[PDB]
Amino acid sequence: AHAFWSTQPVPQTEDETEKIVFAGPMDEPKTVADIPEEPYPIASTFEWWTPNMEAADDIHAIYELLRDNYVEDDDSMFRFNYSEEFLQWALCPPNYIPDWHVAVRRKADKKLLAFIAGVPVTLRMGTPKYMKVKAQEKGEGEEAAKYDEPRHICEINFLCVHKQLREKRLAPILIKEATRRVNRTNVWQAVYTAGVLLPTPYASGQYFHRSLNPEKLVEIRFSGIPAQYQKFQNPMAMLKRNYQLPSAPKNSGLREMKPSDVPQVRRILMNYLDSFDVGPVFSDAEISHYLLPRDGVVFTYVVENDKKVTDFFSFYRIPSTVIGNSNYNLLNAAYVHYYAATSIPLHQLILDLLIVAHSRGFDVCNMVEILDNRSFVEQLKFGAGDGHLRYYFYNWAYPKIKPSQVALVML
């Protein structure tokens, strides 16, 4: 059934995954000198290209590929429209490796046909808590702890093959060439997410959506007027009423994050993320990059009490193209990013996220049920959507975990 994935160092079935008791590698330990130094062969009408993320045209090329060919919902009504500013942010974190960004161009006209991106991430990915307990019970604690140290790996995103080149087996060639470039830098695991089921996730969760401009969401058929709002004489005013929000944040002490906040946000986030099995470790430079406000891209607020940062939240923007509607072209969505609460209940922190997003013109707030996101779904009127996000590793055995034990937000 899987001509390419059956060749790769990943768990092949759920049955195999339910047998995994320790974290660790799947593949032959290899070394850098064993890996081919030459790019993977590709047909003579194509060429490999390494975009220059400091070049505006190169970012534009990648932008147009993804605006016209990247992921859609399952009914082909919405397609992501990541902005050029967001791709420069997401692709160029501290100490990014230019060669981990891999593209195929048609050699004739230099048309971008395919793309995949890798960035560094420092991930805790040792054996999870529930499995470490079984280990203790069998007298296998040392095997179970072997790979506890945070590891410097590759996070993969933005895989895309142009619609005219679909189902020609171009994606496996792009994946093999990214793997080669990453293994040439002495990194042997990756982490990625997908909406589709592939062999084989270590965690899966639903997406949730909090309506901020319900009249537009209904108009573009992102949501409907739900059948129950029919027993009512007037269905939309009632829907607006249901989702209305304050005009200003309710936490006194909330403000935008500034550079001098970086070391306090680092400490409070790192302490919070320790409570999850799988999660990133960020330096001060990586907190600056991922969390300092950037117009149109990432939005971050802290709660300051007695001149100390005690809580914060962040959200990022990804608009979607609305595939043909006469009144609207764009869905403006905010996505819950990292957060940490120490002074107030998480629901009261995240209400201010919704208030800020709504006053900044966002139509919906989205999240996956990772972190402690399930703890504010009902009070903040999030509803499950039709999608899921599945988390995967390349070359890493990992016991199945709940999505509430995952702390890596993927952009």
Ligand SMILES: CCCCCCCCCCCCCC(=O)SCCNC(=O)CCNC(=O)[C@H](O)C(C)(C)COP(=O)(O)OP(=O)(O)OC[C@H]1O[C@@H](n2cnc3c(N)ncnc32)[C@H](O)[C@@H]1OP(=O)(O)O
């Ligand atoms: C150590 C470092 C390792 C670095 C790498 C780690 C691994 C990273 C892995 C990538 C993580 C990406 C994370 C994200 O960005 S997920 C977002 C993926 N992007 C999209 O959905 C955009 C819209 N669609 C497309 O652009 C194309 O349909 C894609 C490119 C998805 C497939 O193109 P196409 O439809 O033209 O097909 P093909 O004939 O060329 O190839 C068919 C083979 O491709 C396997 N397939 C299909 N979908 C995916 C998928 N999402 N991840 C992995 N594999 C996938 C499929 O099972 C089959 O293999 P097999 O079933 O026959 O065995």
Ligand SMILES: [Mg+2]
């Ligand atoms: Mg193809």
